[PDB]
Every structure is written in structure tokens, then in C-alpha cells.
Amino acid sequence: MRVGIPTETKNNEFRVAITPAGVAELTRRGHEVLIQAGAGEGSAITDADFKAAGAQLVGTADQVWADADLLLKVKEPIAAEYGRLRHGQILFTFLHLAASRACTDALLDSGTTSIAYETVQTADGALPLLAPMSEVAGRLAAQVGAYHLMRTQGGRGVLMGGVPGVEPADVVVIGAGTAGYNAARIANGMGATVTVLDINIDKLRQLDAEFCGRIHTRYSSAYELEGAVKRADLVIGAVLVPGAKAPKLVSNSLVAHMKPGAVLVDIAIDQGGCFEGSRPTTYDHPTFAVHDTLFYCVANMPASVPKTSTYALTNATMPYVLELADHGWRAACRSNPALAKGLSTHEGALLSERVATDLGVPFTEPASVLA
Amino acid sequence: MRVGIPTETKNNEFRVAITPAGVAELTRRGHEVLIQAGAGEGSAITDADFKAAGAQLVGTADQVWADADLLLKVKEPIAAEYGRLRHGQILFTFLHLAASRACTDALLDSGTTSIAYETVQTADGALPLLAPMSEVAGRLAAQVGAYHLMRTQGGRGVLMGGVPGVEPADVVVIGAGTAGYNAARIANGMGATVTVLDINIDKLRQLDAEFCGRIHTRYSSAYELEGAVKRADLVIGAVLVPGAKAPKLVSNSLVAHMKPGAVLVDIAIDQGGCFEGSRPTTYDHPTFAVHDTLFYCVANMPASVPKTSTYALTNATMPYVLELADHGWRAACRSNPALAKGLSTHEGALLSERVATDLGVPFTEPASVLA
Amino acid sequence: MRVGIPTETKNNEFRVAITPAGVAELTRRGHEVLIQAGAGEGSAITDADFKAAGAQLVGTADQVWADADLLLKVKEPIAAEYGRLRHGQILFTFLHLAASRACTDALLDSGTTSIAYETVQTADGALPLLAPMSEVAGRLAAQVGAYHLMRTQGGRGVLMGGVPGVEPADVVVIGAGTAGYNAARIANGMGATVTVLDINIDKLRQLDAEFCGRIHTRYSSAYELEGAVKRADLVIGAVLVPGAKAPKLVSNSLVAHMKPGAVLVDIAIDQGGCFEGSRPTTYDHPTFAVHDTLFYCVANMPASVPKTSTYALTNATMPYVLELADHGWRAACRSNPALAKGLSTHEGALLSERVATDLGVPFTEPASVLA
Amino acid sequence: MRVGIPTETKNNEFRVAITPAGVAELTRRGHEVLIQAGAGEGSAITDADFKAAGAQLVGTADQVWADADLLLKVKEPIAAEYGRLRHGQILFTFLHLAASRACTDALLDSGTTSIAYETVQTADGALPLLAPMSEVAGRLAAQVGAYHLMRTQGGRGVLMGGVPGVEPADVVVIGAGTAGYNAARIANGMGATVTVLDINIDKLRQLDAEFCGRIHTRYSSAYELEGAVKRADLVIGAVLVPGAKAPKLVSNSLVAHMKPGAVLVDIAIDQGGCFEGSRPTTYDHPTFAVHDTLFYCVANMPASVPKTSTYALTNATMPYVLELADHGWRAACRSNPALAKGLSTHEGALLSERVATDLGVPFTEPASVLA
Amino acid sequence: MRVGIPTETKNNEFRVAITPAGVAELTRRGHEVLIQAGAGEGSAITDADFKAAGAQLVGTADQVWADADLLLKVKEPIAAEYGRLRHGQILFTFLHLAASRACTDALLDSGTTSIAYETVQTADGALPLLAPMSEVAGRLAAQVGAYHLMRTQGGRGVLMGGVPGVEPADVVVIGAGTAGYNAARIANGMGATVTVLDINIDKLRQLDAEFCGRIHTRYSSAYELEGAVKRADLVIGAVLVPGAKAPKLVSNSLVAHMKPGAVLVDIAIDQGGCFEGSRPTTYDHPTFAVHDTLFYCVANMPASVPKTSTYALTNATMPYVLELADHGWRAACRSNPALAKGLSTHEGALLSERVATDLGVPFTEPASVLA
């Protein structure tokens, strides 16, 4: 079986769906790896690095998409790529079909068999392909917040960690999951005083243990949330609902009461955001004002640290990549129920319940497509 | 005696030379404090805050400059201000007279008696009024470095701390003084692996103790420095030679050998920089390319976190301010040798030898202006 | 030469001026050590422990006082002991002659040559026999503060460290010398959020490095001190000026604005206190109300942990004791300038300037008593 | 539906069963919250604070008890209160029906439907409403032990953390559950050397990892326990068996071999104690002697830090309170099996097996009262 | 001026007196560096590494010795090398002339001008060239002790850190200087419980601060030392008397009371040892019994980690090496009093007081040889 990786075509997407390490593993199992020349450049992986590990470099996208039995991507197929989708081809990538009827149509139209990173789910309910992205975004949030708190960028102009004799920044992190833990850890390391809000006290218990006294924790009643946000220099919204909408926890009237220059970072912005004033922004125009505060809501944040996030994602996808390549999609899916939860599309059929219901019509077919 | 504080007029200087804390102290001792309406805004100190503490708010610059016996500033007098300099007036601020013959001429012409923050020196050779700006700079450097490391900003695209399974950034800090210690500490807090280089082993011993194994230390031979810089994702230049010009420790050919996308932050940029390719940049155009790497050389960096730096500076100046207001300049200088080392100008006389020699002519008069 | 240690007679003084370790040292050098039977009991040192180390147990106080050439105590001679003072006898203890007209007269009268622990001072200005007592007091202050913050004792009823989800206590420590450092450390260890205030930024810099972010530091302007105190659940006064009287840093009006039930602990109570409402209390009636707040001002605090303080004090005194035993007082004092600073009394003469120049007349006689 | 909270009547019970945060939640869901004036005083919550959050302040206890559909308390109804129990009313508090036949009678007699905090149990066997009381207790134990270790209180007179050069206290904690973990953590924070004993090595592994070497762990054989206890200055009994009686792990003959002045704190006192010599004490007479050691056995310890323990408890109860208020008891109990395990009384029937079987007769009625 | 480095000839001396780093610095200032082929192999530095940095490789010892103006070594000249000593040549190495009249004779005879690493001393009394060897020795002592504590090696058979539920090893370190601090640090990191003894309480204070509670400190009376030693699984003797003979602090009768299998490591073995039973051993026969305990007394311990210790040493020597190379010996010595302290020999004259008045006759000549 033949495996192909095209350059990501979306604007400001710098990741690639495989690294030399992954190339090496597939090659040693006798699969052939076709990589579009230039595909790893945004992530600082050169064509030489890919060649060294056994890949065949190929000049054009067209030639990757025709030719590959398994196609690995990072983002969903873009308009210009709809034409390339094929019949006897397994496509594995972030799909988010619910957010694009156009995309879903193109997939079932071409009769492509597709599997979504975001709905691969282990028996304990974990989504192992999203987890690494949440780690990245959590850690990033602390960094971008710190920078945008400079007066020079419109922020209140406080240094994260103060200096001896002077108060550090007061940071609140809403949500104690993977993203929230990671944002808290990095803000803390920068010397800010950090309080995390959650309604799950066991999650707060973990945070309390891990840092002894250092990271403060507070039970997240609306009343305690208001009080904390009112005093914050930096607020990080990190309530990521696995596959739903993400609740709006901070209202515009509450922001109207924050200190002038405070900054709010919405890690939940893909999938809806969790401040009410939230709206997706771009790399060149990352922030905008809401009543005297600064909002930072860049969509698709993990893409800004591609050397890190390419490895983070492909380390997690690798085992699943290997199973597909060795066994083909049915079989791999029969052997591995986590994988099967990821099945989305096969020869015109829509296999996802949340998507079928949600995206107007088509209608499910459970998985019985696994005869 | 009357004490006046004007808005800083240099662009992108957001600090102010007093806080309410200081205002209250001066009032309690029966001095009158004159503050230019709006002076504290960049530092998020309102007129009301200043009023509350006992200050008299004044509508124009001219009114503060005439009226004040002791005039407190952050930066040196700008061209537009030369007109306001007076005869029986003590001016206390960062002067950097060596950098400007125009400024020095305006000072001795007007016969004003001036004391420089940056040459106030205690018996042990410390410069207590620069130290807090070095703390700010060092901590800032790590944050700006981390941010500009994003692909989105032209950097290699690596997250400071990595995420589990993925390597963190390799950060090297050149110089183990106040600035370098602080850079190292914040970068280490963000999860990066950090190596600091210095020729003073005792300073390396302190860093080793403070962090147990965590912060690596290396003796700074040219050979060792080249080796460490060649591997770095992030390099911080923190060699601040206290009143001289700062050695050029990273050469352009050495930068030609660094990883593509590496970022170099030069905290030594005021006073000359310590990379060969260094050149002062501005807040809106902070970086530029040198051979495939990105240089960050923003002058006057402490000014971008004005809420923090105003307090860090004014807490350090306050005891000198109080001694001046209570006793007048001679006497304060006779009592306090550290303050005396700051004496620059009095009634046309230039009192600083480093300056007099350096600045072509005028010629010293030691201090016997203290009859 | 013969060394004697009487039981401490002042009430609730539980320490003893030597341990078996010290007795053994003295014995090995061929001195005779006379100990009043029962002397070590408050400090959980039994007569058998003393005997095992070479001491001679002796039934009565009188027999220790006559017979000993060098007399070691912890506190000053009490009224009932004035009769026991002798002429060819060195007395070494905490004296505080300043505080007792009567005591000074007694010592002069009897012609006793006496050396005070608290004015023994090294070339660098350290007071090495007081330091261990400040360590003890600092650590104790946090313990007592925690306890009296219980509602059951009259305090506002907050646990030092909170529990997950709930705020810890807000603790401010005024003073960053040895006592303040130690109080802050233990408070922090208990999980409280701790801020220390001081006017010496270098001491704030040490505290900041030692705990990375963990212990907050604030420059001690009255303005800043008032803000910190108003928010505090526990305030610990730890400004011990070397040998003067201790400034009053918290006013009664200030206390009237504090949270009801807040507790204030004045470690500076011996030697004056540093709150205005402060007044010496005793172990059985340790606290008293001041406007809805609770003050804790127990005098002589190190005595409440005698097993620790006995050792702390006597480890510090030991080398001075050995010098005096081996060489007699002059010679010991000529050899050792730190010891000579402790000289207080000899053959009717008063040898201390601060005390002569404070306790009305007698008049100094510098030290020339060392012919 | 209408929710009522009476002042706590039991002597030295300072908590209150709701906070403003909880009142706010209930109010926004359109429920009526009746609070007896003064109810929050012990916990430093004013009637103003309650009224701001939407509460109806009510002058008498009887006014709350009639009028309230759901009645929230902290402790069991006392003698004086039995008259107030009603038919169509849900009572939610700490019951301990096992320990009072009288109580139980009153409950079934008045036909009140009551649910007990301490039997609410999640599928995994956790008792989430007891947990926060354990955390408080464990943390408290370390503070009270420290205090009573002073000679002034009868203890042997050692400071928890020692001071440089002098040994710290030897603390042993029996039991590695939530209370044990929290006592050990605070004791260690105060600088003492801490050993914890348990028969569950997994729990010892967690302590080991959490503090790296810092907290010592020892397997709890009687032999090993004997050895540890004999050397300890402070012993904390923290073995809280779920809802049974708590084993007697330290016998009186063993205490006879302990160091004079050692202090033993029994957190397991409510529910029986775990020292043989243990006996409930009160806040004004907290300790008593057992062979030259000091026992501390204050019942109801969490009440002494009411500001902390009120929030800790009510954060944990809140989501149950909301389910009851919104759904009524049947339905809430159908919906939520953890709640159901708490069911103790309804219209004369006794619903708890452990109490039916243990409190002589009445006899169970499983839960079928949920028709 | 030309600089030569011979292979070290002493058995089991693996270090070399320069690294590539050093070669490069020298070369850049226009000095030619002669290195004997093979010199760096013991320290894992190849001839290629040295060549790449500018060195001239030379086949024979004789050729380096004749030809070099400045000769750099690690150890003192051995018998077989006496013949190679020259007239107009500066020799810079560890000499320890007091330990060998033969060696001293050879140096004076040949008229060589020699400077000892061990007596280079800075104004503050530091010996900067021994310090790094003390760091190495202290760190090594913990490793070797841990190893020989296995039964397999004759030790008591305890693991340094224990495992959960099982006691770790009890380690005592005598001496709180650079070596003892480093031994303490590593032992602690291995999980052992560590007590350090010293007479200097300030040194104990530093250790207490640095590790919070973690590393125990005890005042070093004989009485206290005995108690500590009796209980120890491992004792490390770390009292390095700067240039004297090192006190014998552990007696053979004391070792007779230690636990069977205990191991004692004497870092002070070069220079005399600090245990009574101590006796220099060799790498292949490293240990020996003294009453049921194991002594470990390998001479010249830093030589066993030559990759580490070459760098540690040559980093410290480098600035001195550059001053000599650039200025010649007189002048370097006149500019640099620390260097002048090292002067030992010139043209038949013996220039060291301690050595002359210790090594029978010759007689000093202060330094007047600097005309």
C-alpha cells in the first residue's frame, strides 16, 4: 500500500501530516511514501530530511492525490482540492464536517472513504488526536497573553512576573482540562499569580496537588467567576467542550467592568469561543477592542508553532497510520474501535450521527459498511 | 520646596517619574507636588489617583517646569523642552549626556543643576537605579523571544516548552548578570531548556545553586559560545557593560551558521548592542532579517511594560528623591556619596569626567562645587 | 577555671545556658562545670544527660554562684539574685541593661564583670547571638498566627492554606531581615499567600530569588503598606532594628480599617513593638482586642520552644564560652573584638556607651580597663 | 420551590449551609431563599452579603423551618429543634443517625423526608461531601499539633522546623488518605520531618512521587508503627474508616513508651478515635494527659475555621442542592444514585440499612419509596 | 611566545592541561600551541579536535618540553621528567612541593620558573583553581558511596533512596564547604536523608535556605558528631583545610561503634585524610575494612571523570594562562597578585614561605625577584 502527503494549501496552515520518523516507520514496513516537494518547509522539515528517511518526493499535488491509497492531511480539503478526491482512497485528517455542508457534499459525492482525527475516541472517552493540540494551545495562550499585555500592543502594560517589590500580573484561567492546566502551568512559570476556575473539584484537587500552594483554585460559580475576572490582568478561556459548542461564560457586560487594558485569550475560538464578545481573528490582525479590553481570538492557533505541533500531532496519529497502512480501512476499523468512531464517509454514505442529524439531512449508516 | 513631574514627551515612552506612593510620601513631609494633567496615563495611573495622594494637577508643561524646584523625569530633555530648562532648578532623570552634545550644551547653557539616574553609584559599585530596568529587560526578553519564535512572525516556529514527547526550545543566554539571570529564569519557567554563558564562574555557581540542575551553565570561551549559539532556537544578548559600550560577542559569520528561523534578542541595544548585526528598532517594526535569522532590537524596552517599570524605577529613586526635597542638592550630595556620583551639571559647569573627556572638550570640575 | 550554670528563675523562662555538648567540650579542655540540679528540665535535658557529659551536679543556686568563675545564664539577674553577684566573677547572658535601672546598679555595686549576649558584634555588624533567637521567633510567629486565626480563638476563622477550590489566608510580613524571612518561609510552607514589605530592595531581591515567584515582595511605602495591611488576614511585625526602639509602622487608625478577626503578631514586642496598639502579653493571656482585630504580643517568645532555642542559642555562644574559659575575660576580649563589644560592667565601671547615654548618668569608660 | 437556612444552634458550630454564591445560583433559577438573620456571622458572612445575593432575611428560626420546602443545615437537628420538623419538607444535613436514637425517632415521628451529607456516595465509592471536611481536618491537625508542642502548652517544646544547626520535629502521620495526605503536606511545609504509615503501598507510592524524597513513607505493620511512634514528637491519627468505627492503632501501653511531652492529635475523634486513650474534648479544654504525653481530641474540628469550611462544604453540596431545588427529592434521587444513597427518612420509614441494623429495630425500606 | 602541553605520565592521571576551547583562544591571540600526540585521549579529546582548533601536534614528550616557553600540566613532574626541566621556561601545574623534597630539588636545580595552581589566591582568600576540583570530588563522593553500599561490594546493602514504604539511607556529610555542599546535594538528589555537620553556622544557614527543610543541618560538636556518625549508613569526610593538614574528626574507636557495613568516604585523603583510619588507596583496590566498616580513600579522585574535570580545571586556569602567554611571568605577576601567590620557583630560588619553612631549609625570597 502507498501513502501520500500533500502540502497544506490553507492560508497560514504550516503543519504537515507526517515527519521523517513516520516516514521511516512506514518504509521499514515496506509501504511507499509519496510526499509533495516542499510540504515540510513550514515546519522546518526539508525535502532532504524526508528523502533520507525513505520518502519519494513528487513535484505536484495532483500526483500525490492520484497514486496514494492512503492520503494524510492536517486540515480539511479546501475548495480547490475537491476535484482531487477519489473513489478507492482513504483520507485521514481533521474534517469538522458539521461546519461545512460544501465539504461534506464533495466527500460523499466522490465516494471517498474518510476518517476524522477529531472523532477518534478511546473506550474511556478520551480524544487522543485532539489532546496534543490542546496542550499546544494552552501553552501558547500564556505566551500570547503575556506579549499582548504590553502597552505597545494596547494592553494594560504589566509584566507577567513583576519584579522584586512590584506586583506580578493577575491571571485567571477558566477551565481545568488539558488546555487550562497547560496555560496555568506556563503563566505560573512566567511568575504571574494564577487562579483557575472549574466546577469539577477533583480537577481542582489535581491542580492543587501538583503545584502545592502555587496555583490557586476556585470553584466556578457565576458569582465567583465575576469576582475573579473583575480583578484580572489576563483571562484565558480554556473551556473546550469535546465536540459541542462551548458555553459563553464571560458576558460583554462583565467585560465592561474589567480593568482598562486587560486582555482576554479565547482558546475555544475554533468551535465557537467562550466569551460572548468572541469572534475569530487572523495572524496579521490578531486582536480587537471590546469596551477598553483587548480580545485575542486567533483561529487555528497550534499552526503558529508548526515545528512543535506537527510532531505533537503526528506522534499521536502514527499508530493509527500504521494500522491503516498495514491492514486497510475495514479491518483496521474492525480491530480498533477508536478508529471506527472516526469513520465519516464511504462511497456516498455519511457514517457520523452527530453530523447527519446536525447538517440537515443525509442520514446515518451506523457501520455495517463493515460487512 | 516644590516638586514637579511633567508628562514624558518622547514617543513611545509611557513611564512617569513618580507614583501616588511617592506623592504621598512627599506631601506628608510637607512638600508640594506638581503633576502635569495626564502624566500617568501611559502607566495606568489616573489624575484622580494622583489627586487622592495629595498632588496638585496642572494643565500645561510650562507651568510644571517654571514653579518646580526639583524636576523629576524618566528620559532626557528633548529638543522641544530645551527652552524650559531653568537656573535654580534641580533636574533628576536618565541623562546619557555622552550620547548627545546638543543635550549637554542645553544643560550647561541654562545653568541648570542636573543629576543622572544612571551614574548614581553605591560604595560597592552597584548602580541601584539601573538594576530594576535590567530586571524588567531580562524578563521581557524571554517573552518577546518566545512570541517571535512563532512561524507567524518569521521565526522557526517552536514552542518554548515543547509538549510531552516533543523537544522544547533550546535557549542560550549570554551574560549572567541581573539581566541574564532574569532572562534565564523566565525562559526556564516557560519550559525551555536554558544554557547561560559567562566568563565569571562564581556567577555561574550562583545560577547552578539556585536552580539545582535545571539551568545549564557554560564557561564562555569563544569556542564554547559558537558551539552553543549554533544549536540555539533563541539567543538572548544580556551582556550589559555598566557604563562602557558592550562587546560584540556574536559575529555575522556566526549568525550565518545558525538554524534558519532562530531569533536573537539584544537587550544591550541601548548602549550599543552586543551582536555585530545589531541596530536599534522600533515598536511597530521590531525585527529584521540577518542571514535567515530574525533580530529583535527594540530600544528602550522597559517602556513597553510601563505599569511595572514606573513602579520598579520610582521605588528605587524614592529615597534619593526624598533626600533631595528635604535638604536641597548640596548637602544631599554632601551626605550621600552615591547621589554625588550622579552630579552632572551645575551653573554652566560639567561635573562628569567620563562625559567631559568623551564629549570632546568642556572639562571637569570635580565637585568642590560643594564648597 | 570553673564554669557554672544555674536554673533560670524568671517565670516561664524554660531554657538553660549550656547543653551536654557544651559541657563535654569544656570538660575535655579540663574545666570544671557546675550545674544546678534540675537546670535542664524545661529544655528536656535531664541531670543524667549532664552528668554523663562530665558535669558536676550541685543542689542549690547559692553553691553555683559562689564557686563559679564564669557564670552562664540565659536571662538577666532577677531581684532575688542580686545578692548572689560577686566580684571576681564573669557573668555572660542577655542583659538589656537599658531596660533596668535596678539591674544596672546591682551589677555595678557588686563589682561583677559582665558581658551581654545581645551586643556581641562581628566586624560586619552582625549580632550572632541574637540571630538564632530571631530565627526561632520568625518561625514561631507563623505558627501562633495560624492557630489564633481560628474562630474558636477569636480570629476570623480562615485556614492558612485553604483547601482546593477555596482561598488561602492572606499573610503580610513586615520586614525582610532574619525574622521576617523565617516567618515568610513558614507561612508560605503552610500554604498561605505571603507578601513581605521592606524598604531595602536588595532584601526583596533575595526573597524573590529564593522562592522564585512564590513569596510576593512589595516596596514598603506607607501607601503600599496600608494597602497590604487592609487586605490581610494575618500580619506579622518583624522589623527588629539592631539595638534601638523599633518604629511604629501600623497605626491604630489603620487597624480600625482591617477585616474583623484579623490577627497581628508582634515579634518586635521585646524592645518596644512595631504596632502602635502593641503591649507585652503573657503565655496564659496571650492576645487582646484592638478594634475588632486580635493582637498577639507575647514577650520572650523563643522560651516557649526551649528544646529548640536552648540548642540554637548555646551553639552560637559556645565558641565565646570556650574563649573566656580558656583565657579569662581580658585577653579573650583583647583577642576578640566581637566579644569586647559585649563588655558591660567591671569593678563598678559601666562600659557601654548606649546604656550610659541612655540610663541617665553613670558614664562610660571605653575599654582601657584592658590595660 | 422555597429553600431555607437556619442559624446553626449547636454550641461552637460556626458554619452555615449556604454562601451568597449559592444563594445567587438558586435565585437566578427562580427559587426563594429564606435565611435566618445572623446565620452567616460565625463564618464572617453578613446579612448584607446574603441580601445582595438575593436572599430574604427572616427574623426567627421557626419562620425558616415552617415556610421552607428544602431545609439546609450543617449539623443534625438538636433537642430544641425536634418541635420544628415537618411533613412535606426535605432536610439535607450531616445526620449521623447511628449515634442518636433520639434524633432518629424525632425524624420518623414527624414524617420528614431527610437526606444525609455523609452517605452521599458516587459510583466509585467516594464520599464527596465528607472529602472537603477531611482536607480541612488534615490541614488543621498540623497547625494545632505545632501549637501544642510548645512547653507553654504542656508539650515537649520543639519547634516544627527547627532552625539551622538544630533538629526539626519528628512527625508521624498514620493514614495516607485525604486527611493524612493533607496533614503530612502542611507538617512538611512547616519544616518538620514527616513519616506517613499506611498498609496501602499504592497510597505510599503517590506520596513518594508527589514530594520526591521529602515525605518519608513506611509500611504500616504493628512493629513498624511501634518503632515510628516511639521516636515521634507529634503523632497525627488520620485513619478515617469510611462509615465504620476506626481501628485503635495506638494503645496506652505504647503511649507509656513515648517521649515525655509528645503530642498526639486524633482527627478520627468524631467516629470513635484511633488511639486507645482517645476521648472527645472541647475547644476551651482541648487537651489532656495520658502518661506524660498530651492528647488533642477536639470534636468537630472543621468548625473552628468556618470561613474556610463553610465554602469547602457548600461548594461540594451546591450541585446536589440545585438538583433537589429544581426537581424535588424523588426524581432528584431517581436521576442521581449518589443522592439516593443519602436517603435516610421519609414519612415515618427508615431508609438506611447500616442504621436500621445498627440502631436496634425499625427495619429498612430499600428505596421503593421511589414508586 | 609558545605554549606546550605534554601527555600526563603519572599512572591513572587521565586529564590534560588544555582543551580545544583554550587552544583556540591562544591561537587567536597569535601564540603557537604545541600538544603531544595523544595528550587528550584520557579525557576523550582527539588529536583531530586539537588540530581543528589550531594546535600543532608533536610526536614526542621531549619536543614539547624543549620548544615551549610556557609549559602547562595537571600534575607535578615525575621522576622520569626531571631531566626535561629547563632554564627560561615557565611551568604551571599542581605542584604540592611540600610533599616532595625530590621534586622541589629538581625544580631549583634546573632553574625553572614555576607557578602552582594550588596557591593561586584571590584578595578574598578564595583558591579559584582548587574550587572546581572540590566540586568534582564532592559530587563523586556521593556516587562512589552509593555504589559501595551494595552488599555485593561489602557494604551494608541499602539503596540510597529506599523505595516507597522502606527507609532511605542515612547519610552524614562532615563539612559544609564547596565539597560538602556538593556531596550533600547529590546524596539528597539520590533520595537519601542527609545531615551536614559544620562549626560554621552561617554555612549551615546557607544550606538550610537552599534546600528549605530537605537537607538537615547540625552544629558540629564532638558530642553531636558522634551521635550522627553512629547512626549513619554512609559518612563523607569533606573537611578540606585549604593548605594545612586536615583534622582527624572520626576516631577508630568511634568507627568501632558504627553499624556493620557502613561506608566512609574520605574526600580529604590527598592532604592527609580526616578519618583516623584513613590511608590512600588505588582505583583497582579502592576500599578496605576497619572494624566491620568499609573505608573508601582513593587518591586523586577528580582524575576518574576526566572529561568533566579537564574542562572544570582548564576553564578556571584559562584567564591565567592567557595573561602569562601575553605578558610573560613577571608583569603577569606584577599585574595580578592572585597569580603572584602562586610563584614557587625561579632560577634556583624558592619563593614560597609555607614550603621553605616546612621543607627543611632552603629559605624564602619574598618576591623581589620582581625587580
UniProtKB/Swiss-Prot annotation, chains A, B, C, D, E:
Which pathway does it take part in? Amino-acid degradation; L-alanine degradation via dehydrogenase pathway; NH(3) and pyruvate from L-alanine: step 1/1
Provide the GO biological process annotations. alanine catabolic process; L-alanine catabolic process; response to hypoxia
- Offer an example of a GO molecular function term for this protein: metal ion binding
Could you list this entry's UniProt keywords, alphabetically sorted.
Magnesium, Metal-binding, NAD, Nucleotide-binding, Oxidoreductase, Secreted
Q: Which reaction does it catalyse?
A: L-alanine + NAD(+) + H2O = pyruvate + NH4(+) + NADH + H(+)
The annotated modulation of its activity is: Inhibited by CuSO(4) and ZnCl(2).
pH profile = Optimum pH is between 10 and 11 for the oxidative deamination and between 7 and 7.5 for the reductive amination.
Question: Which residues does the annotation say bind Mg(2+)?
Answer: E323, H327
Annotated localization: Secreted
Temperature-dependent activity: Relatively stable, it loses only 25% of its total activity after 4 hours at 60 degrees Celsius. The enzyme is much more active at temperatures above 37 degrees Celsius, particularly in the reductive amination. The velocity almost doubles at temperatures between 60-65 degrees Celsius compared with 37 degrees Celsius. Above 65 degrees Celsius there is a sharp decrease in activity, due to thermal inactivation of the enzyme.
Binding-site positions, substrate: R15, K75
Cofactor: how and how many bound: Binds 1 Mg(2+) ion per subunit.
Q: What is its EC number?
A: 1.4.1.1
The cofactor named in the record is: Mg(2+)
Annotated residues that bind NAD(+) are located at: 134, 178-179, 198, 203, 220, 239-240, 267-270, 279, 298-301
Q: Which Gene3D superfamilies match?
A: NAD(P)-binding Rossmann-like Domain (3.40.50.720)
The record's section on Pfam families has: AlaDh_PNT_C (PF01262), AlaDh_PNT_N (PF05222)
Q: What induces it?
A: Upon nutrient starvation.
If you read the UniProt record, what top EC class would you report for this enzyme, in one word?
oxidoreductase
- Active-site residues, Swiss-Prot/TrEMBL: H96, D270
Keyword Oxidoreductase listed? The answer is yes
Q: Which family does it belong to?
A: Belongs to the AlaDH/PNT family.
List the PANTHER family: ALANINE DEHYDROGENASE
Q: What is this protein called?
A: Alanine dehydrogenase
Q: What organism does the UniProt record list as the source?
A: Mycobacterium tuberculosis (strain ATCC 25618 / H37Rv)
